[PDB]
Amino acid sequence: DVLHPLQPRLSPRNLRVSPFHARHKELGAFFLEAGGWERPYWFEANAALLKEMPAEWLPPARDAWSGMFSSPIAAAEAWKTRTAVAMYDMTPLKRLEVSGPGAL
Amino acid sequence: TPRIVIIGAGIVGTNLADELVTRGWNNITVLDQGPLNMPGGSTSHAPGLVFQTNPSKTMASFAKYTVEKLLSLTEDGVSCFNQVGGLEVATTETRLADLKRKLGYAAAWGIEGRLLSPAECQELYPLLDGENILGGLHVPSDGLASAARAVQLLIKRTESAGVTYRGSTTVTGIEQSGGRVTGVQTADGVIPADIVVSCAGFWGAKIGAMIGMAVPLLPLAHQYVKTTPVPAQQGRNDQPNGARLPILRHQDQDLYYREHGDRYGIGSYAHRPMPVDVDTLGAYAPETVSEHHMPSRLDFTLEDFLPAWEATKQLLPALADSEIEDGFNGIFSFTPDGGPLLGESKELDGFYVAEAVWVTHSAGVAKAMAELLTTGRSETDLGECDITRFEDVQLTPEYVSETSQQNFVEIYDVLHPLQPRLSPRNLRVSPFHARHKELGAFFLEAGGWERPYWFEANAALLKEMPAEWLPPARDAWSGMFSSPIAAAEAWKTRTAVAMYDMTPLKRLEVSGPGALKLLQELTTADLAKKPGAVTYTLLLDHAGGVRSDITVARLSEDTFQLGANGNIDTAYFERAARHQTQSGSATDWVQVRDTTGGTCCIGLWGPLARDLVSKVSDDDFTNDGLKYFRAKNVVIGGIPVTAMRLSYVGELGWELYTSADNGQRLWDALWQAGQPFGVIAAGRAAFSSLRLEKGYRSWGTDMTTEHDPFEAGLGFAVKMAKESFIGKGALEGRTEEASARRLRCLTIDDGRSIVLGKEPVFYKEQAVGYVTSAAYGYTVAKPIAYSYLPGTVSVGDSVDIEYFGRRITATVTEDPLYDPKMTRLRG
Amino acid sequence: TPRIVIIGAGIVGTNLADELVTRGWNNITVLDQGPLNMPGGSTSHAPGLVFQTNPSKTMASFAKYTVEKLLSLTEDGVSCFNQVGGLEVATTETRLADLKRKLGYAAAWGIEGRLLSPAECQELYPLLDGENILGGLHVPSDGLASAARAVQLLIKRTESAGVTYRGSTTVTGIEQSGGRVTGVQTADGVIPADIVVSCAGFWGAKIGAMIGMAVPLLPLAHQYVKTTPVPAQQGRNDQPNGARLPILRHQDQDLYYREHGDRYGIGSYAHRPMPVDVDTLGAYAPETVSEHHMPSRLDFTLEDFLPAWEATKQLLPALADSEIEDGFNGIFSFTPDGGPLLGESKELDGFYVAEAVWVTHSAGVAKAMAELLTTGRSETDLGECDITRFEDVQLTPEYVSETSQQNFVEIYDVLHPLQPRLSPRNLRVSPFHARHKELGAFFLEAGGWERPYWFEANAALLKEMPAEWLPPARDAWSGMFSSPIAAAEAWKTRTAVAMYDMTPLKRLEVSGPGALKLLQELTTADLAKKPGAVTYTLLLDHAGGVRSDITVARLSEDTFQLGANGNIDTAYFERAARHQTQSGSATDWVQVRDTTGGTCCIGLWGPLARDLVSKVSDDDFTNDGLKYFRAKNVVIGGIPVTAMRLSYVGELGWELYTSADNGQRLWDALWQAGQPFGVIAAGRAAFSSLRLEKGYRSWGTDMTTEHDPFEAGLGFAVKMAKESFIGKGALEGRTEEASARRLRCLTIDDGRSIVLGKEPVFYKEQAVGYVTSAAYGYTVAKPIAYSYLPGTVSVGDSVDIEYFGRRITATVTEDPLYDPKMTRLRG
Ligand SMILES: *Cc1cc2c(cc1C)nc1c(=O)[nH]c(=O)nc-1n2C[C@H](O)[C@H](O)[C@H](O)COP(=O)(O)OP(=O)(O)OC[C@H]1O[C@@H](n2cnc3c(N)ncnc32)[C@H](O)[C@@H]1O
Numbered sequence A: 001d002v003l004h005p006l007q008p009r010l011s012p013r014n015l016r017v018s019p020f021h022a023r024h025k026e027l028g029a030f031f032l033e034a035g036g037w038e039r040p041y042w043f044e045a046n047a048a049l050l051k052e053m054p055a056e057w058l059p060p061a062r063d064a065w066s067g068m069f070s071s072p073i074a075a076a077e078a079w080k081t082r083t084a085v086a087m088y089d090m091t092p093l094k095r096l097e098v099s100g101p102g103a104l
Numbered sequence B, C: 001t002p003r004i005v006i007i008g009a010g011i012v013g014t015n016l017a018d019e020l021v022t023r024g025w026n027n028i029t030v031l032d033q034g035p036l037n038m039p040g041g042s043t044s045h046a047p048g049l050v051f052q053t054n055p056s057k058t059m060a061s062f063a064k065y066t067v068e069k070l071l072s073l074t075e076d077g078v079s080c081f082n083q084v085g086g087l088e089v090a091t092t093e094t095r096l097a098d099l100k101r102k103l104g105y106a107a108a109w110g111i112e113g114r115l116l117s118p119a120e121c122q123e124l125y126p127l128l129d130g131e132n133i134l135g136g137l138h139v140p141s142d143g144l145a146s147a148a149r150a151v152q153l154l155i156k157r158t159e160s161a162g163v164t165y166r167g168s169t170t171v172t173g174i175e176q177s178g179g180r181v182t183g184v185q186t187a188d189g190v191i192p193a194d195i196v197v198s199c200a201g202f203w204g205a206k207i208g209a210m211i212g213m214a215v216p217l218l219p220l221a222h223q224y225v226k227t228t229p230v231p232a233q234q235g236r237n238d239q240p241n242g243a244r245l246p247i248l249r250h251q252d253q254d255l256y257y258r259e260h261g262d263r264y265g266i267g268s269y270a271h272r273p274m275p276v277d278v279d280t281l282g283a284y285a286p287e288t289v290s291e292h293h294m295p296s297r298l299d300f301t302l303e304d305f306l307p308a309w310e311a312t313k314q315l316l317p318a319l320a321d322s323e324i325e326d327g328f329n330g331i332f333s334f335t336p337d338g339g340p341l342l343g344e345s346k347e348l349d350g351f352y353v354a355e356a357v358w359v360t361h362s363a364g365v366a367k368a369m370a371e372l373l374t375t376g377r378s379e380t381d382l383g384e385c386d387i388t389r390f391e392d393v394q395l396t397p398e399y400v401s402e403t404s405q406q407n408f409v410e411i412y413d414v415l416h417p418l419q420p421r422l423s424p425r426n427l428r429v430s431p432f433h434a435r436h437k438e439l440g441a442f443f444l445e446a447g448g449w450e451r452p453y454w455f456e457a458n459a460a461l462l463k464e465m466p467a468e469w470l471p472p473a474r475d476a477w478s479g480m481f482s483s484p485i486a487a488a489e490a491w492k493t494r495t496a497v498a499m500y501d502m503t504p505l506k507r508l509e510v511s512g513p514g515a516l517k518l519l520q521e522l523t524t525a526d527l528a529k530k531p532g533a534v535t536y537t538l539l540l541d542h543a544g545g546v547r548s549d550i551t552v553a554r555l556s557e558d559t560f561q562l563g564a565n566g567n568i569d570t571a572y573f574e575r576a577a578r579h580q581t582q583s584g585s586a587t588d589w590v591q592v593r594d595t596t597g598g599t600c601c602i603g604l605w606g607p608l609a610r611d612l613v614s615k616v617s618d619d620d621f622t623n624d625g626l627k628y629f630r631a632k633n634v635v636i637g638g639i640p641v642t643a644m645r646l647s648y649v650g651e652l653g654w655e656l657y658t659s660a661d662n663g664q665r666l667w668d669a670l671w672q673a674g675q676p677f678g679v680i681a682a683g684r685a686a687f688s689s690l691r692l693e694k695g696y697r698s699w700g701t702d703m704t705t706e707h708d709p710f711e712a713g714l715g716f717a718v719k720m721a722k723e724s725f726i727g728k729g730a731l732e733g734r735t736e737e738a739s740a741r742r743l744r745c746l747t748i749d750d751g752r753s754i755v756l757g758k759e760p761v762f763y764k765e766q767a768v769g770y771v772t773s774a775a776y777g778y779t780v781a782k783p784i785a786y787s788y789l790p791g792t793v794s795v796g797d798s799v800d801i802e803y804f805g806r807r808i809t810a811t812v813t814e815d816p817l818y819d820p821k822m823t824r825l826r827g
């Protein structure tokens, strides 16, 4: 099959979620998955910001292929990270603890 | 004939006066606050590019008529149309593909055009830098309107026929009595009128406030610039405003161009939206109005034009050897959906609008409005143009401002037919909204309502779905706003049981001792039956065209519930009810209420529907308890419900109606009862596919006022034996078998090439139709498309449908495609 | 006088015939399917215990009248009441406390009673095993009714006065024309009638179905047993049914007792609910009806009685030396709220019900119904008895069965006034329900609606709340269904801004050319003002009693929105509207619709309300934009809203109304706008407290039809200058200052002893009133209670309120307690 590089499976999904999952769903997260973890790629709540976003932040139209699994909402999220304050879910990033007198 | 006052002597008002005169109505006064020699609205600044090809059949037809009429409007051997042709160029692959779709519209609506290669574009338009040009769409019949000259020639010939023009005359109010217009107020007194038509351009909302009418347009400014003389153009054109090259669109950069002698004109939408408050413009003394000084022209803002100027030099390098000479920010109108605003006001009988109209469509709008006024109907479908199409949340100043600014931003963008706005959203939701979100609904919006198209919860079913139900891969365009989940939802509707949210479908209650009388005249059904009957019926106009299809349920002697198509229907019934009440006896009064927002409806459909409902109700839902096309009151999960036995999707079950406060309980009761039967929530994508498999006609797409019932295959819904109903006389003698054009079901032979709507349909290489409704049919496992075809094309014949320039073979197929013997519905 | 047919010759129907005759109406036919000497309904098996004390003032008054009337009904020197007194014993501390509350009801309603110690109980009732007895409540005037003998004596004296009795006559249908009753159908023809009253006991729902009326009673069976001769009782009483000891209640074990000569009778509710299908009983040939063979008696099920028999031997050990002799499972009626069903049907003019009535209240119900029929009103408040009190979800067979069975299970339980059912719940929810659950709403229910009483989200505010707002600890009883969170919600309403859900408050739309005319006659206001006015007004009866208080908003010439008290109001307006339409001209027609379930309302109140709304609306909400007690249409968050400026809680702000589909958006828009102002959601506990601080009267509690406007302190709402309105004539000359009894505000001096309602109020040691509305006042920092008091008691006087047997000192206080100068509401 012809498949986009970001194409998700539709099943099995929701195997691993962070503690913020219910809050993310309240905010309209668009989830893709990697390593079993559900990861928001943008939040539909932020679409409401696009109408106040300064014109310099608005990207041009995308073609169909680069537009797959993409949203203009991401521009607003970048805008607010650069100018205000943002909360990213970093839970899925691999975390190891190395301990003991031999760790160093 | 009636005394008419037209407000506005722009291109719309003067064409309307002309179209009325030609139809023998000449008791007309046209008013304008500006001087008659140069009124000073948008018509007085438009450069006049006319591109006819449009996705809307109606707008394309308006443009074709405008070109024809302007070519005919002449004095001293010079017409008001310079037919240079039109060229749209593509600088991206996305745009190149969209030009192939537009070539399809051209063929569908009867406009001649051709796709051009980069080399052919360069031959046609030598000033192009061909490096970035990927191809073009050439329409030889497009060209340049002389709008200001047309206004002057229309004024001259209508004045000769008896029309009165009064310039320098400002309308300050509207006089009324008894709910009907009687006059127009000015500083100097009242001008009497039986009919008033507001043709006031971007002042349309200011006029509407004079009668308490919401007119959903927003005045916005748009930049237009002229260059100094361009060296490459020296000696080529007639001075000072000659043109020889086709008008030029560069939609990837939001620009358009025309020649003005040896100078260029540049129109740009590539700037911030620029809303204008009409109350700040100032009154212009008519003696001061001139080319560069008029209400419609605001000061140029060069800073907004710099990017457009750079993009212009890239496309047309010869212009880099010229300079900007003059620019202005010109005011015109935008609306929430980009459509114009036509028709009779809800608030005042005899008061009409014809506003938010480009020069391009002006003569077509005027013709349609002249037809409406003089005969009671337009010869062209106005469903996308009627002012009454809007829902109440769509008429607020905030909605009109936000959505019309977005329409400006997107004016030249490539957009899919299902593309949603991202804001404003969540205006109207059904009582099931929280449950829908629990199930991962994918929502799109229409009329302000959030509507699930499928549910992510159902993705878990795909791995157990039988292979016969799995559709092939979709291409990128038909794959937009689509999911394979819809196949699973269709599968479970056909084999188990499903819950559809029917809440957004327009619901009217018609009540009172005059309700039966009203509906007996307006519809094509004999509704005088003991309560409990549900009847599918049509509303016609006096020419027999189909205004709407409606389902009528008689709930009691004096109460009927109607399933309708939208707010055009609401306004039609409201006025008809008021007129019957006003002119009738104590037994003729009737009220109409739009109850949609206060109620809700679940379509509970599938072969296990009786098994499910039996767990939560003691009412009799067997065939003896409730027959097909009947209604009765029941209790489900403790909630009083009106159950109607019918199904758009063609399965066992019922539409279940209740008040909004009870909806969540009804939902939850049915949901719990359905667990052992594998109940699912099912969305609009599956709904549309299953309903098309049943051959349902969608008003506005599969039939309009341009079609009679017999052409549409809806003859069964017309009871010709009735003594009286609107349209009966026009329909005498007509049959389905004798109809010159007939609505036909097509299936796509390759099983995979999905079409979407508006694609042209060819029979033996000639364009003879276009796609109305379309969907992938999950039960028949192939794409489906409907089209009108000449009556001589038969079931079993082959036709081609053009999709993005490729011809797809399809077969005329008998419908319904699924269960034509209704075995799933009976017993 | 009118021709009356009464269906049923039980204790109700025969007392009704008697009460009509005494009022000079004797054109009455009474029908019964059973033989007149022993009809065979529940009256033919009742043992006749009459305990007068009840939490309901109306039911207590009905019982007092029954005792008086039965003592008066005599032949051969033997009356129909044996006044042995009544004793309720307590075996738990919970029950002992509840007897102190019941002693309070006794004092409130004018019944003499005393609390007895264990020793005194033993002196009064020597057969008690005193070990487990903790105390008793003794009411000397209670006793034993001879219900079957009363029926026979009533038949005799009404027959003499002209009443016709027809036994062995089964009603099979009801004849009607023009929406009014005309007759009663039997196998032998139609008996003509202007008025029909269904007194058919547990067959009431079967009769109601004959006219399409839902009668919300459930037939249920209840065990009653007689013992063999009890050795300890040998020689003590007259044989065979004599009694000397008080009737005995043992509510902790769901049992009651009486003597029958030397045998005991035992009634038990300590068994599974036993619903009965009346259609299975079989028709009894009248010649076969006898003491042990009649429709109302089903076969005894000993297995259900064994636990009751064991509990009986424990309480009364002498009975262990007897045996069970005979038992039966006797059928009677239960209803969803334990109240009877009285009044005129919604479905049929002139058709009345008087059903689900204990022998205990029978003569009082009959008197009230005789008053209703002969004068148009009852002299006793029927708000808790009227058949029209029920909401539509409360009339389904499923609701009536579940809730009436729960009422049987709980019949003798100690229950708090706010105790909710655990099922059925979530029948009706507002559009804000999901948001409320996000905020941790604590829901209670009324009329089927889920209503937040407080929000757990607000617990986080308690740690920043100023100390003056923190209330003292509550005792266990007043602490039930209460939270300290309510103080925080009151604090923020008074100092910031709060959003109350007003959706459940009854909302009626009255429309049509006759709407103004109807309301001008029914209300005490002059409503003929240009649209936009909001008026608080009263509905009176013809005696000037207060049927309801209503807020009327005139939204247009022919449309009014009413805020009402419940479905008694709905049915009252529906019938008045139909009668005006039927008898009126083409300009008199009027429709009434209950729009509550299709709409919603947010009360946006607090000093920051203008700051909040200004962020989400461009409409003018200043004093010049919208004055106090005015309404206008606005847009908030993109949603069309009807804003009304008034506040139950006494702060700046508005009631904001919209359609249900728009409610969640309106909520979310206001919520987001309110974040910088510290907006909270606020629930019913705070609402009730703040509204009582404003002196608002709650219909049904603070005033009923027993009170005129002047007694209630509502004189300001009566426009005596009006030409005409129902009740005007009765009110001529009356004033607040001359009223013999006046509604007064009391505050509890100790700042901590909260009372709840119905507690008796004493002035110089005499019972002179009782608590109507009550709440802790968070702004005044003390408990508040209202009561009627003799006119000679003044502001500043001291009264005592008895709560669980303890006297609490309170002061008559001027009201409103908060902001009587309305500074918070004006400007
Ligand atoms: C501004 C603009 C518009 C434009 C364009 C470029 C610019 C910068 N380029 C176009 C193009 O190339 N092709 C095309 O098809 N259209 C183009 N347009 C849009 C076009 O100009 C307008 O859509 C069209 O001209 C609108 O015509 P209409 O006849 O509807 O409106 P109008 O010319 O503005 O006339 C309205 C008249 O009403 C009078 N009026 C208003 N209020 C009153 C009162 N109260 N009393 C009396 N008279 C009143 C005005 O004076 C005006 O003359």
Ligand SMILES: *Cc1cc2c(cc1C)nc1c(=O)[nH]c(=O)nc-1n2C[C@H](O)[C@H](O)[C@H](O)COP(=O)(O)OP(=O)(O)OC[C@H]1O[C@@H](n2cnc3c(N)ncnc32)[C@H](O)[C@@H]1O
Binding pocket: C007, C008, C009, C010, C011, C012, C013, C031, C032, C033, C034, C039, C040, C041, C042, C043, C044, C045, C046, C047, C048, C049, C050, C169, C170, C171, C172, C199, C200, C201, C202, C203, C222, C223, C224, C267, C296, C329, C330, C331, C332, C333, C354, C355, C356, C357, C358, C359, C360, C361
């Ligand atoms: C069953 C029971 C009831 C009871 C009780 C103990 C038992 C086991 N103990 C009580 C107690 O000690 N104190 C008290 O106050 N009440 C007690 N009760 C309840 C009491 O018996 C009933 O609530 C009361 O008797 C009801 O009286 P009412 O007059 O309302 O009803 P009825 O006696 O059942 O009479 C109805 C008559 O209607 C006739 N009917 C019905 N349908 C028709 C038709 N279609 N046509 C003609 N006549 C009809 C019936 O025949 C009946 O006689």
Ligand code: NA
Binding pocket: B254, B269, B270, B408, B409, B410, B411, B412, B413
């Ligand atoms: Na754009």
Ligand code: NA
Binding pocket: C254, C269, C270, C408, C409, C410, C411, C412, C413
């Ligand atoms: Na019990």
